[PDB]
Amino acid sequence: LAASLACAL
Ligand SMILES: [Pb+2]
């Protein structure tokens, strides 16, 4: 989940 947020942004 954490990585998905950073990736998206
Ligand atoms: Pb990525």
What does the alpha-carbon distance between residue 2 and residue 8 come to, in Å, rounded to a whole number?
10
* Maximal C-alpha separation, the chain: 13
Distance 6 CA to ligand 1 centre (A): 8
Distance 4 CA to ligand 1 centre (A): 7
Distance 5 CA to ligand 1 centre (A): 9
Distance 2 CA to ligand 1 centre (A): 11
List the structure tokens of 5: 């947020």
List the structure tokens of 1: 């989940």
List the structure tokens of 8: 């998206």
Three-class SS string for 1-9?
A: CHHHHHHHC
Structural method: X-ray
CA 4 to chain centre: 3
Experimental structure resolution, Å: 1.0
